[PDB]
Structure 1
Amino acid sequence: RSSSYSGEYGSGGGKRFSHSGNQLDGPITALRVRVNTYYIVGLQVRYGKVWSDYVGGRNGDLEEIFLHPGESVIQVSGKYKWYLKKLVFVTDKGRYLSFGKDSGTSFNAVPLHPNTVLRFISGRSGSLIDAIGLHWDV
């Protein structure tokens, strides 16, 4: 069994979401994160050439980062309070894809099993991102 799960990081408000179906579209190839003065407001993840359904709220500015072909996320750190505040996606090409404000309770997620990478995310959302979980696999 190579799959593992890190989380859930954050709190209990909002509604649950999961990108479990999306990994069939492809590897993660891009990230959209909506950010405001204090929080991570929303998330979208591109699986192959297909963006996930948008989750979270509308009160923030959209930031977008494309991963290079064949680049994988191998660690995710972040910060929260009652809501998510910071995410850093660490890649196997040595990049640190950072979003949000450097404040709050710290977390540091790494995969349990050998040569696994981030395959999808889940969490909770409303008008903000309440919580996040990371799903690792081959």
Structure 2
Amino acid sequence: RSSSYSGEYGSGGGKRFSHSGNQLDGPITALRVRVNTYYIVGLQVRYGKVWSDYVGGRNGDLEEIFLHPGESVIQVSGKYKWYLKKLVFVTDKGRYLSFGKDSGTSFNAVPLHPNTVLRFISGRSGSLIDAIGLHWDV
């Protein structure tokens, strides 16, 4: 196996979600994060040309970053309490795509195996993002 899973970061509230099928549409090309005063409310990830189903709640402001062609995520750090509060996507182009608020329990996620990148994300959500899981592969 060249695949790995960083997680789960957050708590066990709400229902679960997986973007496992979405990796068939392509690599991660853009990111959507909805953040409010304290939490990360919602997530949406663009695989190839296709956006995923929105997960989370409505109580926040939409933030959106497109990735450069051939750019992939190689590290993910963040913060959480019972709910996810911060997310930072580090890309191989050396960019730091920070979303959310600077407070809580920190985590730092890197792939296990050689030359692997973030392929899809999992986690739990309700009206906020309870938990996130990071999936790595070639």
The reply to whether TM is greater than 0.5 is yes
Root-mean-square deviation over aligned CA pairs: 0.3
Q: CA deviation at 1:23?
A: 0.3
Q: CA deviation at 1:120?
A: 0.1
Q: Per-residue displacement from partner, 1:77-136 (whole Å, max 9, x unpaired)?
A: 000000000000000000000000011100000000000000000000000000000000
Q: CA deviation at 1:55?
A: 0.0
Runs of 4+ residues deviating >6 angstroms: none
Distance 1:25 1:127 in 2: 27
Q: CA deviation at 1:9?
A: 0.0
Q: CA deviation at 1:19?
A: 0.1
Q: How many residues align?
A: 138
Q: Structure 1: where are the runs of 5+ without partners?
A: none
Aligned to 2:15: 15
Q: Per-residue displacement from partner, 1:28-66 (whole Å, max 9, x unpaired)?
A: 000000000000000000000000000000000000000
TM-score by length of 2: 1.00
Q: Structure 2: where are the runs of 5+ without partners?
A: none
Distance 1:48 1:22 in 2: 9
Distance 1:2 1:73 in 2: 16
Distance 1:46 1:58 in 2: 19
Q: Does 1:96 align with 2:125?
A: no
Distance 1:56 1:117 in 2: 24
Distance 1:103 1:63 in 2: 19
Aligned to 1:106: 106
